[PDB]
Amino acid sequence: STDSTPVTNQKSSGRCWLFAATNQLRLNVLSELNLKEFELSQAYLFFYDKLEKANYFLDQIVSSADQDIDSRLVQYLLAAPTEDGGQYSMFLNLVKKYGLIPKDLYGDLPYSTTASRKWNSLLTTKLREFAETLRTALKERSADDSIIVTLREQMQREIFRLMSLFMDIPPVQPNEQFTWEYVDKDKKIHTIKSTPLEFASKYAKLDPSTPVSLINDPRHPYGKLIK
Amino acid sequence: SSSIDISKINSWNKEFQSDLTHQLATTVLKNYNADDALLNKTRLQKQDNRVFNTVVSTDSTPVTNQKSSGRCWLFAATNQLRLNVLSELNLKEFELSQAYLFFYDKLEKANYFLDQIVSSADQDIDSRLVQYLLAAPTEDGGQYSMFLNLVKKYGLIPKDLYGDLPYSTTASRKWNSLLTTKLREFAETLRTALKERSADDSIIVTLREQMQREIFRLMSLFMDIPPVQPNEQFTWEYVDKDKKIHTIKSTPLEFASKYAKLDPSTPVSLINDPRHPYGKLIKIDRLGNVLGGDAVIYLNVDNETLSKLVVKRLQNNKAVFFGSHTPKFMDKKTGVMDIELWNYPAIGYNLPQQKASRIRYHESLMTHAMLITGCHVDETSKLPLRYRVENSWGKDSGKDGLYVMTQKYFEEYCFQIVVDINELPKELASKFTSGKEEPIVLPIWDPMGALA
Amino acid sequence: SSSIDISKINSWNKEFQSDLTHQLATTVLKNYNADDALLNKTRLQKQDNRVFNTVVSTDSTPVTNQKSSGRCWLFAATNQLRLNVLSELNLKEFELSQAYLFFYDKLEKANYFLDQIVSSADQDIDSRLVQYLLAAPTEDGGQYSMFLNLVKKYGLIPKDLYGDLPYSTTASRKWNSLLTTKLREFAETLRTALKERSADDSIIVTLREQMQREIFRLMSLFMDIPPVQPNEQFTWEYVDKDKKIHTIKSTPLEFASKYAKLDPSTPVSLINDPRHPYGKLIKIDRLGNVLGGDAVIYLNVDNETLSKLVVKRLQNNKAVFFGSHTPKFMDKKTGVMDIELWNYPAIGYNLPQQKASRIRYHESLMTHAMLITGCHVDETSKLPLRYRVENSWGKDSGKDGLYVMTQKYFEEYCFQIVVDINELPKELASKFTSGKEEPIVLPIWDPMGALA
Numbered sequence A: 001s002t003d004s005t006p007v008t009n010q011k012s013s014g015r016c017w018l019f020a021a022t023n024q025l026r027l028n029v030l031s032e033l034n035l036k037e038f039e040l041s042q043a044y045l046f047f048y049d050k051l052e053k054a055n056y057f058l059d060q061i062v063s064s065a066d067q068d069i070d071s072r073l074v075q076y077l078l079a080a081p082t083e084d085g086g087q088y089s090m091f092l093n094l095v096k097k098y099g100l101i102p103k104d105l106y107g108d109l110p111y112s113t114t115a116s117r118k119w120n121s122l123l124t125t126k127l128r129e130f131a132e133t134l135r136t137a138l139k140e141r142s143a144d145d146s147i148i149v150t151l152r153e154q155m156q157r158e159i160f161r162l163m164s165l166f167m168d169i170p171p172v173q174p175n176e177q178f179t180w181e182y183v184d185k186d187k188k189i190h191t192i193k194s195t196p197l198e199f200a201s202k203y204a205k206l207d208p209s210t211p212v213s214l215i216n217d218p219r220h221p222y223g224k225l226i227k
Numbered sequence B, C: 001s002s003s004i005d006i007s008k009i010n011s012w013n014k015e016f017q018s019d020l021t022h023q024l025a026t027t028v029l030k031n032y033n034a035d036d037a038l039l040n041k042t043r044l045q046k047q048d049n050r051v052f053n054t055v056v057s058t059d060s061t062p063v064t065n066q067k068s069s070g071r072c073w074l075f076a077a078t079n080q081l082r083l084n085v086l087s088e089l090n091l092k093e094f095e096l097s098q099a100y101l102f103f104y105d106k107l108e109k110a111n112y113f114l115d116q117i118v119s120s121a122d123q124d125i126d127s128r129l130v131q132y133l134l135a136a137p138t139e140d141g142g143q144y145s146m147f148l149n150l151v152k153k154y155g156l157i158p159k160d161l162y163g164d165l166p167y168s169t170t171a172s173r174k175w176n177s178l179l180t181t182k183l184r185e186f187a188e189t190l191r192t193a194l195k196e197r198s199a200d201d202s203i204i205v206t207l208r209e210q211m212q213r214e215i216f217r218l219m220s221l222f223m224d225i226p227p228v229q230p231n232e233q234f235t236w237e238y239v240d241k242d243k244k245i246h247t248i249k250s251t252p253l254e255f256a257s258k259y260a261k262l263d264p265s266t267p268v269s270l271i272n273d274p275r276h277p278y279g280k281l282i283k284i285d286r287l288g289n290v291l292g293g294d295a296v297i298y299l300n301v302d303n304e305t306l307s308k309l310v311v312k313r314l315q316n317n318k319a320v321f322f323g324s325h326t327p328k329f330m331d332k333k334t335g336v337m338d339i340e341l342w343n344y345p346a347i348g349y350n351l352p353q354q355k356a357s358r359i360r361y362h363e364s365l366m367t368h369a370m371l372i373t374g375c376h377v378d379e380t381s382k383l384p385l386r387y388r389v390e391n392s393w394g395k396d397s398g399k400d401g402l403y404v405m406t407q408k409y410f411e412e413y414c415f416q417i418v419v420d421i422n423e424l425p426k427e428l429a430s431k432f433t434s435g436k437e438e439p440i441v442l443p444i445w446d447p448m449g450a451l452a
């Protein structure tokens, strides 16, 4: 019944999954708030997704430190650590920790949201440097080591430092309140004060506990779970 | 800890925003591409220098354009040779047929793939090798040894007899996709038939012939098989710089030696792979195009010798085929290749990772082959500062198709050159003509095994 | 010392280059326009807000475009009035003829100029006043009093009867140039004749009539005199929003009151000129268009009262004509007018000079007239934050022709609004209806005397 308004454009990025996942949800807000046009912030999720993958990569390197640099897994981890693409479970991972917010508070303004190639390249080049540094330090020490722990924190920090140069950290924290003024289809002005996490359930109607992704993979038996 | 803490990142943010350089950086970096924003004109002012004291006498005429294909290696290899014809026949403009080699290269790789599948039929479909063979069986890129494999079996021909007319020579994506989709079907069919039978089996033999035939049938729909066979005569009428008409009757194979001056037995490719010891031979397992052709082998040498081999070669009036990591530190608008052209340190972005580790950690590899046609030694008593590079992207790329590469770029982001064995020091040439030399064998998926 | 020392500047350079912020700044600033490089998207993210709780019910339809002319003042003044017709006649789209007023304004200024030359004939040709009169006698820009001068003598008419058809309405540069070149010839001729004779002289009188005639002759070559005279009837057929056809027979002068609802006797222009005391009347010497028309006089008021007069007016459902310094702190792409939109402080560029001094020191003046159609009071218990502005640059400028101006911008880079005297506090209205009020008289070349 509700119409996808307006038509979205991911531009030069692989953020389709976030657009599609949020396109499904925008319809609830549009409908529940009687809005002519509406969009949830795709960039919001994009910022956190990229930060998390860079961080996640570091852990992956640490957990595979025992394998040769030229092993299939290590070379794979090193191929595209910050790629824009994702899965629905990965979409929910972000919504659970960060919530959802209207695009009016944080949009596709930065150059990197619509042309992410360079940003990813700069980040990935650093991460590949970090990968070497971690593994080297892991030859002599254990991951639980105070030194390693310190090392990973300084990497995380540089990763955030570099990402904040291309995009601003969202304006409000997940449990922090934001005020959003808008106009409904009736030219009537409204104001909503919520938190990214509350807004996701309350307005976007997402209960992260309900969606499951069904796949059609003919190489495996049906009724079976694939991980 | 190991997880992203929200309080932690907002605290770091607060701290970064108090630094004035960071404030300016985020302001500009949210507006423009980092390379555009950070391009350093003070440095450009000095580095964009087109004076070269050591240059190849003949001029690359005309500037070539590979368009939407990965045929750089063929353009660069033939760009090196065209200079001989241009010179020996007193021609204003001249080009050898890149498409000629392209047709045969693609046919051979499709055929070569089939054999690779047959020889790895014992491995699981999801093994690293089989999945690799299935990734890009007909890709346009190649190596110099693969270039010679083709010239040995097919010779060379002037572009006037067979050019870039077909849509697929300048926009090969679709063609490759159609071919590859079929080959992946064939791969399954072969392996299945190989579970019950042996490769020597009459049935398998028949099967592969029907695949080869369909492969040729499909390729002939997008490009015509060259007009003459390698030992078949062709007649080529042309006009020299003096407006004088001439006619040459030759064969693709004769023309290659006779006019293009190529003796396939002399070029060797030297590589600069810091992960391995120099003076050692490096071989890429399974890498090839012509079933039965030669294998890709490189003599691993230091940059100091390499730099000299390039100057000497240039002094001997010959262009130097080289492979590097495009477009790393390359400004296509100006044509400058300088690792310090952009002011990344102004935003505190620094990269200490070494060359060997860059290769090891999936960060740098050869991706494009170009041609060094000149260089400039420091006019006093020092060494080469920059090199003149001829690209195959049309005359609008760089400065009229030409680029200038710094010595430092050459050392860091360039991994290969091609010289004639007779140009090497006895100590090095011998590694090719001896026998003790057991090459360090790298897998097909090794970054040096990644074509151009 | 007072001279530029070469050692000194190279020493300063050396010191600036050691600062990392300066290094980044020079790198980026040599690449892009400062406004493009410094545009702050973090700030834009918050400031580009199009929600206005107090707006004029009628919508500006359609968005107007003055094109290559300085007719903003006429567009803005008529944009304020069109809303009455649109509303009273239930029309989807409507426009009063801007060209109508433009024709008469230019004719009158050329004529007015002649009189100005005659009245200053006793001054040297190189005096400040005479050179000023000769600078731009026919410029497109004007003031609101000058707008009323025209409406009083000529009335208003629907654009359907006389529009922007002629080349010169949308590209007036050449026309003005041709006219001005003639007027400068006339200026000499008048003054010369005035050395021997008196202005009341039959000969001079004859001379001025022949000049007036040539002026009209030349203007009629680029634009047609409006189709009806001010007291002459015209018939206008139109279609309302309900697809219903109507016909109105009126006169330009009647239509102005009857349909456009303008009572020329009510609007007064309030100015915010910090160099003079508030509550005081400011008059611009010699500024005008219609010989004998009213003079430009402003009531100097503080921003606090001014802000309120705008909110009240908007609440009374009327648009507010205002004049400001375009394009200072104006982003045409987004339509944002915010003095903090660009990160100049990140490059250490700061401007402490006060408004009054900005005006005094040749830095800020009114240059464009636009229309406030809405505002947004802080929804709690505070005051106006932003205003909705309608520009006359087509629907592609700003956001569909519309702009958003901050309160701070309004205070700093805006110098005038127009209200009806009945909207003023008794204390202020009286300054217009009393007699004690001797206006502070400013010269014709004063920055507040610089049109729009």
Ligand SMILES: [Hg+2]
Pocket (backbone or CB within 6 Å): B069, B070, B071, B072, B073, B141, B367, B368, B369, B452
């Ligand atoms: Hg290539």
Ligand SMILES: [Hg+2]
Pocket (backbone or CB within 6 Å): B054, B311, B375, B376, B377, B384
């Ligand atoms: Hg040299």
Ligand SMILES: [Hg+2]
Pocket (backbone or CB within 6 Å): B307, B310, B311, B375, B376, B377, B383, B384, B385
């Ligand atoms: Hg050299």
Ligand SMILES: [Hg+2]
Pocket (backbone or CB within 6 Å): B272, B306, B322, B410, B411, B414, B415, B416, B417
């Ligand atoms: Hg090299």
Ligand SMILES: [Hg+2]
Pocket (backbone or CB within 6 Å): C069, C070, C071, C072, C073, C141, C367, C368, C369, C452
């Ligand atoms: Hg104007």
Ligand SMILES: [Hg+2]
Pocket (backbone or CB within 6 Å): C054, C311, C375, C376, C377, C384
């Ligand atoms: Hg308001």
Ligand SMILES: [Hg+2]
Pocket (backbone or CB within 6 Å): C307, C310, C311, C375, C376, C377, C383, C384, C385
């Ligand atoms: Hg207001």
Ligand SMILES: [Hg+2]
Pocket (backbone or CB within 6 Å): C272, C306, C322, C410, C411, C414, C415, C416, C417
């Ligand atoms: Hg104002």
